[PDB]
Symmetry: C3
Subunit: 320 residues, 3 copies
């Protein structure tokens, strides 16, 4: 007869822990972010074998874009090429693009590593070096790695404020990330301040486990997961978020898979009645905000179904 | 023996109402929107203590961007500053940025309310007023409230057409929000026309409960929830959407939390061989389209499981 | 007594096939795409009744934008209008905008098919043709169809590489689309190579069922569904994706519903100290990446609940 009570105790433990008496429903989320911080860029680079100085001040309008699709982008490094115009120009000296005569490459060939339409004419590029010219924007962008000191390294000091509004459409419940009457002067901490939504990017990378400088050198992808485990029952009601960080970057470190996060941005203008384009290769950090959760509310039908499923179980337990 | 029939009646009530005989599947959605309307802007503003006239016509290409991430943006107000260039300039007179001598502020200090790198030199700004200069884009943008009459108030008359395509991957079912052979000349109404997807922004604000002018003064965020409650069984098949509107804005009304929705847009160009930037502080309404739903189809396994779980229930009910 | 074994056989059938012993949890996805390919555009068009030649080379920075909201856009056709400035100009000759005298149209009228504010003055447009002028950007963009040969037809030869990172937050499981030590030189095939994520757009349209030329003529919307059916149990562990393609475009083919996918892009500049705008009507293909799935792991509670639910079932089966 002791088993008759042990089974009932296990049933009660299951009902309490698993919350089998509640209907659980998914979450509908909306995110709004604001990034603040200014960076003083001052460095020296080598463009086309010539030393150049990059100096300036970047404010919020110079390194980011408004949030779109629960994600915002923070720019950290750039390579600029100015004065490009459509025409004919030799390709960059490379093993695939090198030639000794015009027969080395054929007209109309398209190479994956090239940004021009080949025309088959091996012209001298520089210092008795011959490459076969292509029809594209000229001059061809120099193939170089990102600067070894990150240009916008101070971006590790920027602060992002996140507002999350969640709704459970089946129930009549909607709430927000920032409750009224809460401090707005915060720097997020795992234990000291786990609820104020102001995050520091360097702190995010510190908790996750990487170094901000190395990632910002070639860009990357990170994600801020906001988990909502909400109990909406009147007796025990609690609906608060939990913040975690996870690097979504693949860390391929292989040139064939395009490691890191980067893209190309184009600005078109006119000079001396000639159309021109300037190309900025931008390396940055892409922050995703993955908001997930569920909400449970008491339901009579679910409780009845669970009790019915348990009734035969403990009946057999008594019988056996 | 009457309880033996009452339990069975409740059994059938639960089975019919809760649809316990149906496997339920989430929804995969795709949204495509088109916003139309032109606004004639004509007003007078005060920039740097001087009266200026803003007059023009804004078409679809001048106040919105293509939909990205199930959300589109509608511009409603702006503050323009043209002719900025990198250099040294005094900051705007403010309690934090004010000084009587050069010792008031230190070089290299960064202030959250300032957009420049401080250099520590208290120079005259205007009319025997001294502030310590910073290195940034100059002249520093004037911090002022949005114009009391909303510039793009006529944006309340714009019309948005929404096309939603939903799919249930587990089942072989996909459908669209606009069925064939339906009127395309519509203005959405709660009761008169609840299925045609052409919405008027002013009407959205009217059903939601706010006023378009006040929200458009400082921006805001709304969400157009499209709920799909679809029964895919052949006997009783119905898959139609229901439209609701909900304001996702936090309505903080506190300057520390950045009330409303706004951002900064930058346009870079060259003038007299000098690089320059023009900055537009844009206030607008961000419309989100939260599409959620589920689809249920008859499943033998679910029906068998429910019947088995309730068999012990009514057996005990008869026994007791 | 044979039924006593048949019921148990169906019991095992349901438990094995339906995986009723597993707790199933949804998926959290992050997508990162890279599109490559250059198109040599060379064609002749008719603008304002005059023959013009469009020739150039488009690289990755000239026909696409960085991925935002699990979707990327590839431009395929464009119509350019340059030199627009704010002012008064007659509208395009149309049945709605035609007039014989100034009384034909009234000042301030807003027509849906026009992009200007009517001022009520029927002036000559061209060759003894009278339309009433409007205040807007001038000259009014010509109402013409897209060029019959798609300008960026070669966009069917572009290649897109997709990296998907999925996480099951409830369990301690995260994985990626590209496993280590796998070939990166691929062209996706239904049977020959179903796991390498390099897709050719022409191949996507071939598997889906349409022709790339017709779709690219007026634009369209497509979706690449990545389905993750993952079993995380140690005995039988497999978590691999399956790729499918589906056209999300409505295919309305009715002018009132705006068939295809297109938008208007604006570039603002200054010429001779006069503000000017150039408008590009862009037709392109919007690729969506709908990632969905679920992950199941063994749970004792679910197994106990299913066993309790089915115990009464087979008990009645024996009794009956
Ligand atoms: C136009 C060019 C540009 N175009 N897009 N874009 C961009 N990229 C990615 C984004 F997420 C947002 N914005 C930028 C960045 C700033 N840009 C600048 O010229 C610039 C501005 C300030 C200071 C300096 C300095 F320090 F070098 F002198 C420069 Cl060079
Ligand atoms: C370049 C500047 C600009 N840059 N971005 N942008 C923008 N902002 C947010 C978006 F969602 C989309 N587009 C705008 C708006 C229009 N712009 C204008 O100059 C302009 C155009 C027409 C009429 C007038 C008028 F009435 F003032 F004379 C002006 Cl001032
Ligand atoms: C500025 C203008 C422009 N502005 N935005 N934009 C755009 N649209 C949609 C996107 F998804 C991304 N980018 C474009 C495309 C290229 N553009 C060009 O001028 C251009 C460039 C190269 C060759 C030629 C050629 F062949 F005609 F000579 C031209 Cl005409
Ligand atoms: C970030 O700020 C701290 C002080 O708040 C400063 O010591 C540090 O140098 C800054 N980071 C960079 C990259 O300059
Ligand atoms: C915020 O925190 C400060 C100290 O960090 C504390 O003195 C203050 O009471 C808190 N609340 C408000 C509203 O400032
Ligand atoms: C919107 O249109 C109505 C007429 O359709 C007009 O009376 C009203 O003034 C317009 N709104 C604004 C802000 O002008
Ligand atoms: C659309 O509505 C009008 C009146 O609002 C009605 O006369 C017409 O029959 C409806 N259907 C179509 C296809 O126009
Ligand atoms: C795409 O490439 C193939 C060869 O790889 C070529 O035959 C075809 O003409 C190209 N497509 C277009 C539209 O030129
Ligand atoms: C890739 O495929 C080629 C042939 O398609 C094969 O020879 C090679 O072994 C594969 N793996 C690698 C790593 O190249």
């Amino acid at each position: 007869w002791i088993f008759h009570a042990l089974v009932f105790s296990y049933i009660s433990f299951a009902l309490i822990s698993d919350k089998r008496y509640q209907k659980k429903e998914p979450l509908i989320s909306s995110v709004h972010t604001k990034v603040k911080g200014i960076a003083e860029v001052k460095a020296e680079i080598l463009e086309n074998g010539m030393k150049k100085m990059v100096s300036g001040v970047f404010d919020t309008a110079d390194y980011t874009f408004p949030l779109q699709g629960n994600s915002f982008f923070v720019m950290t490094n750039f390579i600029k090429t100015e004065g490009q115009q459509q025409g004919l120009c030799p390709d960059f000296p490379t093993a695939r693009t090198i030639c000794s005569s015009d027969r080395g490459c054929k007209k109309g060939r398209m190479d994956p590593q090239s940004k021009g339409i080949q025309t088959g004419r091996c012209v001298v590029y520089k210092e008795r070096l011959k490459t076969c010219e292509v029809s594209a924007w000229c001059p061809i962008e120099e193939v170089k790695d990102a600067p070894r000191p990150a240009l916008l390294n101070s971006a590790e000091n920027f602060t992002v404020l996140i507002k999350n509004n969640i709704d459970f459409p089946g129930h009549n419940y909607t709430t927000r990330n920032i409750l009224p009457g809460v401090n707005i002067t915060c720097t997020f901490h795992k234990t000291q301040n786990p609820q104020c939504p102001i995050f520091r990017l360097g702190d995010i990378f510190q908790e996750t486990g990487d170094s901000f400088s190395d990632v910002a050198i070639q860009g990357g992808i990170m994600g801020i997961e906001i988990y909502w485990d909400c109990n909406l029952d009147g007796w025990f009601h609690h609906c608060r978020p939990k913040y975690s960080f996870r690097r979504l970057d693949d860390k391929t470190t292989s040139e064939s898979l395009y490691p890191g996060y980067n893209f190309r941005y184009a600005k078109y203008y006119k000079e001396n009645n000639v159309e021109k384009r300037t190309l900025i290769k931008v390396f940055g950090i892409r922050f995703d905000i993955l908001v997930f959760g569920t909400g449970g509310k008491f339901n009579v039908i679910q409780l009845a179904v669970y009790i019915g499923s348990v009734i035969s179980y403990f009946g057999l337990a008594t019988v056996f």
